[PDB]
Amino acid sequence: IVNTIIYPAFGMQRMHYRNGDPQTPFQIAEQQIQNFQVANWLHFVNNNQF
Amino acid sequence: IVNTIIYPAFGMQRMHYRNGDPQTPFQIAEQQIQNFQVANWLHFVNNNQFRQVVIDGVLNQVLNDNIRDGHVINQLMEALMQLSRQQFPTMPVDYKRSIQ
Amino acid sequence: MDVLYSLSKTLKDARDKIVEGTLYSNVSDLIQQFNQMIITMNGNEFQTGGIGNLPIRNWNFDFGLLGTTLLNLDANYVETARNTIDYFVDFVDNVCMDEMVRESQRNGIAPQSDSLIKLSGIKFKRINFDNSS
Amino acid sequence: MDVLYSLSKTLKDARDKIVEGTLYSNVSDLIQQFNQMIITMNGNEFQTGGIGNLPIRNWNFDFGLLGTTLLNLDANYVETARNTIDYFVDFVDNVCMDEMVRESQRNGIAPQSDSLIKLSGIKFKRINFDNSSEYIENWNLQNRRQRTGFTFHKPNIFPYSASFTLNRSQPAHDNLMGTMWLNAGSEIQVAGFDYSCAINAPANTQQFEHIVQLRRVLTTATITLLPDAERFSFPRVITSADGATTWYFNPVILRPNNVEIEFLLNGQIINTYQARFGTIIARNFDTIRLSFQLMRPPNMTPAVAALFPNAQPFEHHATVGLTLRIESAVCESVLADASETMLANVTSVRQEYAIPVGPVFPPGMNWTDLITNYSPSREDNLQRVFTVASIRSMLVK
Amino acid sequence: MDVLYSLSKTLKDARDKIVEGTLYSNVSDLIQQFNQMIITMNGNEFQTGGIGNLPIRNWNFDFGLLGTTLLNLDANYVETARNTIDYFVDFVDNVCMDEMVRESQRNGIAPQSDSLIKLSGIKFKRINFDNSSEYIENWNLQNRRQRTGFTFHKPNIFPYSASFTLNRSQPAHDNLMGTMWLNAGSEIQVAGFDYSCAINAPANTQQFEHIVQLRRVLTTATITLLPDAERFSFPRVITSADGATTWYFNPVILRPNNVEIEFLLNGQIINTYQARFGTIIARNFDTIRLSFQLMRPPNMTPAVAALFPNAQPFEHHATVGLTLRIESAVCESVLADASETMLANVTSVRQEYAIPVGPVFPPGMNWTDLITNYSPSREDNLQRVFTVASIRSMLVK
């Protein structure tokens, strides 16, 4: 999602996002780009649990 | 073992390990490991030198072995307990999963 | 005892770092610590006071943890939190005061109050943190 | 306002935790907060100054973010950062100073300057963080209307007052009885004198009393009380009450008899100490009352007897006194004390920029005048102004 | 240097946040920083001591690291850690002390010891972290050539000086006029005396003046100014200026007339106060000038008139005085004050280890001698040495 849907048509490409296994990939997109609507999704999804 | 195990899955030296030819690479690992369980294995293993000293039933030097090992066994119990806390991060998932 | 300490730095670093407008991630490491507490507590009941003019108030715990609404907190988040803090504050005050009056010749270096004696219990040690005071 | 606070702790915890070396991981939580700021700012425009000798300065924002990439920090990383910080520092300074000068009667609590008024705006609230700085800590608790409180060493609660009261006097001022004192800062010295050495007094004892009313309640005060008032133990030539002439005071000191100190709150005795010198605790009071007596010595060696004749002239004047010093205390209202630089910071910025006298504060931020008529407006303005001074001192000293 | 700092805050924030029980995710960011260190160190050898009675202990490094697993900490975890910390503590102590004694005329601002010189090395920079300790904070801001600044309660700016100046005297010392004073620490007391009570003086007024030149500028000073100099209000027998005889001082105190205090900076009046007693602010000054007068009382009751005859002998000596105390102030240079233990720490370590007198500091780190000739070299060495003392006090008190 991060590398083919949100960055790539949100003028945020620049670095087609390089990830090399372990840590959390949604997560890190959160503290990277700014936009509120986009920004709430991230925290709610990421830290969403049972 | 050292490389493709412990060190990284345990998160410690992510510098995997560089050896030329000191005196017992398996050992030295000790001096710098922060988890006692792990740490005892090391000295015991790098020792257990096959306690080469015996003169029984009249002249029978038969390099003996630890009562410990013998049937005190625990060594095993400890070899396990140390294993019981090697379950963690660093690289891809299918890794820890499979290994542990 | 050390237990006690935490309880506070928890609240301070709380009533301080938790305000209308800070990014979640500035408290991620904190939030956690907090919840951890609530858990260990809930269920157990306490008695403070019972000496001189000091009132005997009974404290009981029954609290819900903390959400995590993303991207800087909304006012609403705070108020629902502050309400929970205020019960702990008014608590600790009563806890401190109760152990701040008892004295003992033999062992006057350990906990006296029914309130604190219970804290030194092992099942609570799980809280201790940031001992910089 | 709280906004403002952050701006600093941001920079401090910044100009502090960001240096050639350290691991990213120690600042990860920080870096973020920072950027978040730049964003909210960029695009906006400001204006500070314009009053008195204060320069007018405009500021704009258009800055790049921070490399959340790297593992460790290389020198180059810092310098490109420090360059951005320095613009904010030089900024805040100008922001503080600009709001540290304006006063206001009606609402002397809320913001004044065009600079800050704009900050209280909602769109900036996205910046608050880590309010452990004692002052802001109390700024909040007061908004929510709750029990505040500060800490002071040698507080400055007593407006300067140095005077006397003659309870018995006559034109020649050769047989006086009364008290003289000095109330200033955190100290009180008071002496009771009786030229006649209680020769005709009931039980040969003259009673004295000194009452001091604080303008604000002090709680948890650690106090030193000592017998004798050294300040009033030496020969003096003093102006008469009407200023028409001068009298002579030639003291000889005796121990104060039946010393009783009362710390009252709304007329009620909260703490009372009878002849206890050394360190005493006064836990909550708005008034101090010192009562002490001069008792004519019932037995006197010749040398002593010679000082106290049965008839005038009375040449050696029997004097008893007390000294009381408030070492530390807590007050719900801001006050000047012997350690904090707040009053000095506010007073200094106003003096340096030739700020005109306003409608709230006395000329020169004079402490005695301020504490003497410590109105609600002066206190709200003082607290606002002290809190800003404390925010400023986190970066600029 | 900055390196050094870290080493500690590392240990403190360590011996503090690492306790039986706490949740790991409170130290995740910390743990890391720690390990990072061990690494950089291991494989290095050090040596401290070698001077005076300072032992020469040697150190080596070779340590394992720390687990990262475990939701919470088990007792066992701590003890295996504390054992490693204790070697670093006992280390740093020896490191501090070793660099806290050496002085260098040349670069008394640079590292000295074989121990530290090695630390400033680049390969160690990978350890820096969290510079919020007031002293280091200022160490940096200076190294970058910028505006420093510190905080002091009752600063120690005045070298001890207790003397007098006779403006009118004669062999018998029976009709003197002049001033006597005590400048020490943060306080000044000065008295002006005129045995003749200005009987033949123009307007029956004798002018006095006392000037004190600070060795460093003080800014944002909160000051208490009170009339009278109690220290010079009692009878004294004093040595004559030439030491050949002794004179008698028998004071009687009058209120100082036309009191004017000026706080000057480079000859310019920055603050001036006319007869204002109590709390005053002096925002930036390198000199204090106190001017005051003795005015013969125009109207005197008999008792007063009797003290001041038209002709000698003059037996009661008219005296006026002032007392000034700097409660708090900011200085761009380090100074001793009434609260900080820096001077005492440095002086104490040197005394305990019998450190020989060096080329920079006066014998015994004598404060009066130091502040009297506060050269750039002494200040740079003092700052280095004070900053190290402050780093040490984070762990060892």
Curated annotation (Swiss-Prot), chain A:
What kind of modification does the protein receive after translation? Sumoylated with SUMO1 and SUMO2. Sumoylation of viral proteins seems to have a positive role on viral replication.
Q: Which domain of life is it from?
A: Viruses
Compartments, record wording: Virion
Per the record, the domain comment is: The N-terminus binds RNA. It is necessary for encapsidation of VP1 and VP3. The N-termini of 10 VP2 molecules form a cylindrical hub underneath each 5-fold axis of the inner capsid.
What the record says about family reads: Belongs to the rotavirus VP2 family.
As for what it does, the entry says: Inner capsid protein that self-assembles to form an icosahedral capsid with a T=2 symmetry, which consists of 120 copies of VP2, with channels at each of its five-fold vertices. This capsid constitutes the innermost concentric layer of the viral mature particle. It encapsidates the polymerase VP1, the capping enzyme VP3 and the genomic dsRNA, thereby defining the core.
The record's note on quaternary structure and interaction partners says: Homodecamer; each decamer is made up of two conformers of VP2, called VP2A and VP2B. Interacts with a VP1-VP3 complex. Interacts with the intermediate capsid protein VP6. Interacts with NSP5. Interacts (via N-terminus) with NSP2.
Q: Please state what the protein is called.
A: Inner capsid protein VP2
Which species does the entry assign this protein to?
Answer: Rotavirus A (strain RVA/Cow/United States/WC3/1981/G6P7[5])
From Swiss-Prot, chains D, E:
| Any matching Pfam family | Rota_Capsid_VP6
Q: Which UniProt keywords apply?
A: Calcium, Capsid protein, Intermediate capsid protein, Metal-binding, Ubl conjugation, Virion, Zinc
Q: What outcome follows a substitution of L70N?
A: Loss of in vitro DLP assembly and transcriptase activity, and almost complete loss of interaction with VP2. Loss of in vitro DLP transcriptase activity, no effect on particle assembly
Please classify the protein's predominant subcellular localization into one broad category. Answer: virion
The protein's matches in InterPro entries, at most eight in alphabetical order, are given as: Capsid_hemagglutn, Rotavirus_A/C_VP6, Virus_capsid_a-hlx_vir
Domain of life, per UniProt, equals: Viruses
Q: According to the UniProt record, what happens if one changes H153S?
A: Impaired homotrimer formation at pH above 7.0. No effect on transcription activity or on VP2-VP6 interaction
Which positions in this protein are listed as binding Zn(2+)?
Answer: H153
Residue positions binding Ca(2+): N266, D286
Q: Where in the cell is it found?
A: Virion
Keyword Zinc: yes or no?
Answer: yes
Query: Its Gene Ontology molecular function terms?
Result: host cell surface receptor binding; metal ion binding; structural molecule activity
Biological process (GO), any one: fusion of virus membrane with host plasma membrane
Q: How is it modified after translation?
A: The N-terminus is blocked. Sumoylated with SUMO1 and SUMO2. Sumoylation of viral proteins seems to have a positive role on viral replication.
Residue ranges for the region (Interaction with the inner capsid protein VP2) are: 62-73
What are its GO cellular component terms? Answer: T=13 icosahedral viral capsid; viral envelope; viral intermediate capsid
What is the protein's quaternary organization?
Answer: Homotrimer. Interacts with the inner capsid protein VP2. Interacts with the outer capsid glycoprotein VP7. Interacts with the outer capsid protein VP5*.
Additional remark text? The VP6 trimer contains a zinc ion located at the center of the molecule. The zinc ion is not essential for either trimerization or transcription activity of the DLP. Zinc-depleted VP6 has an increased sensitivity to proteases.
- Which family does the record claim for this protein? Belongs to the rotavirus VP6 family.
Role of this protein? Intermediate capsid protein that self assembles to form an icosahedral capsid with a T=13 symmetry, which consists of 230 trimers of VP6, with channels at each of its five-fold vertices. This capsid constitutes the middle concentric layer of the viral mature particle. The innermost VP2 capsid and the intermediate VP6 capsid remain intact following cell entry to protect the dsRNA from degradation and to prevent unfavorable antiviral responses in the host cell during all the replication cycle of the virus.
- Identify this protein by name: Intermediate capsid protein VP6
